[PDB]
């Protein structure tokens, strides 16, 4: 059931960490992918694979899991992305076990059916990040590590007071999301709880003033970008917003809606705009991820189930293709040795299908219709315009900068005058690009099949803001 798929990447990452060899990670990620796909199919509803086990009877803690429409496809997305990062990695530092551990942690994070288990995974996801950052790459590794870790922790620890207030002030007997949702929080008490939630979730969203931890994180990881891909998967902020933040304290969200929508708009614009000024791949991709998170948070905060479903779909797909771009930059490093955009121009003539892979990925990034980005982008646009037209319009002065930075990077990296000549593709990279394009096309052209579980949650939690 759910716990099996949640733990499989954890146990495989352990067996790669202490045990040998690297190859165990490829087959482990494949087994995870197949299990998460099987869980994604035949999904009846939320209780699909429900798990309930007691841990602290007195304190009220229970292992609580289940596959919602959201948990299923996010499991599938994570399994797929980490499998891709597992085959193509080329890190081979024997630490892909850390990548599988982080995968399993993010799985448990998403599948949490009770508040405290979610909080536990939210705090646990910090350790592998600092680990694969510190000992596996980067010159400013220590400083970026401290910055990112301290930001996450300064956000997270007061959220413990927030969750303690949310449980105690509501008289909810347990930490179960069912029970906690059964007992609402009052005015000027849901206010403070939501404020403590919004700090920890915005600094991890990321929004504009709280994003300063993102570029240093992405720069000094392993140059291959496996750690970077998993950190982009670590932008789970929006998710916690929609399921936990807003439904548990909409009274404060009433005053905070405009502020948060504005932050999402300006964050998206700022990221997609600065990404033009980026002189390296890590900076560009970090600012792009910031823009996408701004869009997703905008869609969720706008109410308007259109916007919410768009935000979540865009979140999953952006995680997928941003992780793909990170791994691609790492592979081009391993074959070349640099991530600068100006140098190494002739790539296109030497790289037959790596050019096409990078192009498909950047197209999915700028949100091209037919690929994964556009459904979420447009649904979020609709929902935001429903909520507040002004911030939606400003926020979508982003596709312009999206095309600008993506095309500039692609052109000056591949198109221009022939250089020395570069390796074409590796055998693992073949399956990588094939599966990447397959998933992108399937998620972009057929958004009907995916995200069907997202519609009920969207409309229910959007009507919840009403009477």
């Amino acid at each position: 059931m759910v716990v099996l798929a949640v733990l499989l990447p954890v146990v495989f990452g352990a067996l790669l960490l202490l045990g040998l060899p690297r190859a165990l990670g490829v087959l482990g990620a494949g087994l995870s992918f197949l299990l998460n796909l099987y869980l994604f199919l035949t999904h009846p509803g939320g209780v699909a694979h429900a798990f309930q086990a007691p841990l602290l009877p007195g304190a009220g803690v229970y292992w609580a899991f289940g596959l919602d429409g959201l948990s299923a496809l996010f499991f599938l997305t994570i399994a797929l992305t980490v499998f891709l990062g597992a085959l193509v990695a080329r890190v081979e530092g024997r630490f892909l076990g850390l990548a599988l551990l982080m995968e399993g942690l993010l799985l448990g994070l998403f599948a949490a059916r009770d508040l405290l288990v979610f909080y536990v995974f939210f705090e646990a996801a910090l350790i592998p990040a600092l680990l694969m950052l510190y000992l596996y790459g980067g010159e400013g590794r220590t400083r970026a590590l401290y910055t990112f870790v301290l930001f996450t922790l300064v956000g997270s620890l007061p959220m413990l007071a927030a969750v303690l207030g949310a449980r105690l002030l509501s008289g909810s007997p347990t930490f179960l999301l069912e029970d906690l949702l059964a007992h609402p929080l009052q005015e000027e008490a849901a206010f403070w709880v939501f404020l403590g939630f919004a700090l920890a979730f915005a600094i991890k969203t990321p929004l504009f003033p709280l994003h300063a931890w993102l570029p240093p994180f992405h720069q000094e990881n392993h140059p291959s970008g496996l750690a970077d891909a998993l950190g982009t998967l670590y932008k789970v902020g929006v998710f916690a917003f929609f399921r936990f933040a807003i439904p548990l304290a909409p009274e404060g969200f009433a005053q905070a809606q405009g502020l948060l929508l504005f932050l999402a708009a300006l964050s998206a614009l700022y990221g997609a705009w600065v990404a033009f000024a980026a002189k390296d791949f890590k900076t560009l991709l970090a600012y792009a991820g910031l823009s996408h998170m701004g869009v997703a948070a905008l869609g969720v905060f706008s109410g308007t189930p259109e916007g919410a479903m768009g935000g979540l779909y865009l979140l999953a797909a952006s995680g997928v293709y941003t992780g793909g771009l990170f791994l691609l930059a790492g592979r081009l490093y391993e074959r070349t040795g640099t991530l600068e955009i100006g140098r190494y121009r002739g790539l296109a003539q030497s790289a037959p299908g790596l050019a096409a892979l990078a192009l498909i990925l950047f197209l999915a990034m700028v949100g091209l219709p037919g690929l994964s980005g556009f459904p979420g982008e447009f649904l979020t646009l609709l929902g935001a315009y429903k909520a507040s037209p002004w911030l939606a319009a400003l926020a979508f002065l982003s596709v312009i900068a999206s095309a600008a930075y993506a095309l500039t990077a692609f052109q000056k990296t591949f198109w221009e005058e022939g250089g020395s000549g570069v390796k074409d593709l590796a055998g693992a990279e073949w399956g990588f690009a094939l599966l990447s394009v397959l998933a992108l096309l399937l998620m972009g052209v057929f958004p009907g099949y995916f995200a069907r579980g997202l519609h009920p949650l969207a409309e229910a939690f959007a009507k919840l803001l009403g009477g």
Binding site: A212, V366, A404
Partner: protein, 605 residues
């Protein structure tokens, strides 16, 4: 399901020629592409002959996947498939010895399939899908020869302007979704009838739709991106300027006629922008010394004509000019491509001349095209342009000054078309062309294109003569029509227009054979050569300042991270101020101890 094959064929073709692609002989990619285009023309003609078609598939909740094949969609489909088959043959001939044959024809197939996705649409998001797919294929083909950085930034600029237009499109669609909640042109029309609500918001949505149309069809101010499409090969420029990627601007208005007709002010604005676009294109065409640019500015002028037609509510008239133009401009481009194929890609005018005798079957193509564009009294271009000139007065909103404006534009089109023909084919010789100027299979579809250009013609004729296009175009969409007409005086106007066009032709003849270019004309030709100094201003206050702001926001982000650093440093400094509290003098520790204990004892009350 059968209708989807029209799109699917030049997608499987694209996938074969892109993925494997070079596993084939040289002609085979073009062979497969042209064969798929032909067997798509066939299946579209067969489906239309069966009365029409509909297709609906499951998609985003509230936004399903809706394809509608009616008279209006089938019109564009037949045009695109036929001209695409002709240009595909012309590329099979024209593309030679340059790598990427398979890639090139895969781009062709993808372009065709995406344009079909555009026209076959009962829902506006599918129209947007086609929009962005055509924009991507255009970016790809314009930068076909990647080894030159210069012919990359052109497609960069093209796609950027395209995405500005696409953002306007998206916002208008969000508007017409917040209002109604349908976003399917069928039910959108069935819901827009009757008691309109919030007319301000409706006019705003239509204005944003027109903004998207401007970027797609390169109207003012977004004109500037089109000439740079000269970077791509000549058949690419033909398919972009004649049959696709610009005609979509007119097709959007033709389908949204029900929206634009209840917007009088917006339609009048469209007419004004079309007139200005025609004026700019005509005034800035002849100053260009290159064939590709002097044709691109003419494309600007002719699209201005079409948008003038669709501005006053003359939708079938705009489609008439679209038909004639898609014939004769494709003719011009393929002729020019054959010409530079004779000179090895010389691609200049001042380095040309005296190609009349030396070029068989090509001077004829060039003369047919120049006469059709200039408005030779008995030619398709004359019928279209003067039908627009008449619809100016006959259709609503008055067309008072627009008539004389478009007439001057007809004069100027005659003049600069004669400039092109004269300066290219007559009155000197320079350069070299020994062996193989005229190819069979390039000029062979060009024969058919010249035939269609001549005889597009009489589909739409003054009411004594049969008007075939108007009854075909009105029922499918643009049903509401309120236009008067006249006779006797209408034919006096046709005669005045024909005489004016002939005077413009001979005026260009004498002025551009003269080669003297007096004082003022040199200044004017220089100004037109520099596109009336538009890009100089566009990069002055817009593009480079946006770059400066991007860099400024980068510096500001660095500064924000520096402020976070300062917070941490304040924390450490406070920490060592508190760690300084313990010096080691026991008297100090005892005093601070007793002090803290006394503070505690006071707090307890």
């Amino acid at each position: 399901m059968a209708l989807l094959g029209t799109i699917l064929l030049p997608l499987l073709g694209f996938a074969l020629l892109g993925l494997f692609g070079k596993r084939m002989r040289e002609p085979l990619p073009g062979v497969l592409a042209s064969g798929l285009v032909l067997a798509s023309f066939l299946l579209g003609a067969g489906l239309l002959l069966s009365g029409g078609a509909r297709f609906q598939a499951e998609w985003l909740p509230g936004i399903p996947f809706s394809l509608l094949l009616d008279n209006l969609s089938g019109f564009m489909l037949l045009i695109v498939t036929g001209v695409g088959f002709l240009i595909h043959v012309y590329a099979i001939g024209y593309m030679g010895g340059d790598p990427g044959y398979s890639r090139f024809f895969a781009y062709f197939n993808l372009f065709i399939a995406m344009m079909l996705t555009l026209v076959l649409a009962d829902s506006y998001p599918v129209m947007f899908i086609g929009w962005e797919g055509v924009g991507l294929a255009s970016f790809l083909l314009i930068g076909f020869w990647y080894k030159n950085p210069q012919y990359a930034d052109s497609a960069r600029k093209a796609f950027i302007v395209n995405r500005i237009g696409d953002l306007g499109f998206m916002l208008g669609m969000a508007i017409l979704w917040a209002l109604y909640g349908t976003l399917s042109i069928s039910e959108l029309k069935e819901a827009m009838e009757g008691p309109l609500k919030n007319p301000d918001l409706l006019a705003l949505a239509g204005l944003l739709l027109f903004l998207g149309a401007v970027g797609k069809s390169a109207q003012i101010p977004l004109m500037v991106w089109l000439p740079d499409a000269m970077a791509g090969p000549t058949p690419v420029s033909a398919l972009i300027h004649a049959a696709t990627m610009v005609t979509a601007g007119v097709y959007l208005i033709a389908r949204s006629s029900f929206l634009y007709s209840v917007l009088p002010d917006v339609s009048y604005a469209i007419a004004v922008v079309g007139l200005l676009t025609a004026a700019y294109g005509a005034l800035s065409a002849f100053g260009q010394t290159d064939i590709k640019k002097i044709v691109a500015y003419s494309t600007i002028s002719q699209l201005g004509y079409m948008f003038l037609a669709a501005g006053v509510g003359a939708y079938w008239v705009a489609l008439f000019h679209v038909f004639t133009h898609a014939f004769f401009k494709a003719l011009l481009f393929l002729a020019s491509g054959s010409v530079i194929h004779a000179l090895g890609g010389e691609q200049d005018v001042r380095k040309m001349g005296g190609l009349w005798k030396h070029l068989p079957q090509t001077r004829w193509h060039a003369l047919i095209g120049a006469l059709a564009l200039g408005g030779l009294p008995l030619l398709s271009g004359f019928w279209s342009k003067d039908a627009i000139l008449a619809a100016t007065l006959t259709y609503p909103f008055g067309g008072v000054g627009f008539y004389v404006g478009a007439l001057l534009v007809a004069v100027l089109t005659a003049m600069y078309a004669m400039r092109w023909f004269v300066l290219v084919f007559l009155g000197e010789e320079r350069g070299h062309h020994h062996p193989h100027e005229a190819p069979p299979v390039m000029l062979w579809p060009n024969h058919l294109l010249a035939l269609g250009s001549v005889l597009a013609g009489y589909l739409a004729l003054p009411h004594p003569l049969p008007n075939v296009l108007e009854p075909f175009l009105k029922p499918a969409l643009a049903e509401v029509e309120a236009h008067h007409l006249s006779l006797g005086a209408e034919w006096g106007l046709i005669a005045l227009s024909a005489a004016v066009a002939l005077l413009g032709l001979w005026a260009g003849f004498v002025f551009f054979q003269r080669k003297v270019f007096p004082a003022w004309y040199l200044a004017f030709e220089a100004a037109s050569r520099e596109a009336f100094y538009v890009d100089r201003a566009y990069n002055a206050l817009i593009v480079n300042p946006l770059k400066a702001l991007a860099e400024a926001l980068f510096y500001g982000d660095r500064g924000l991270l520096s402020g976070y650093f300062g917070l941490g440093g304040a924390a450490r400094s406070l920490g060592q101020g508190l760690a300084r509290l313990q010096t080691g003098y026991l008297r100090v520790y005892a005093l601070l101890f007793v002090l803290g204990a006394l503070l505690l004892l006071g707090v307890m009350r």
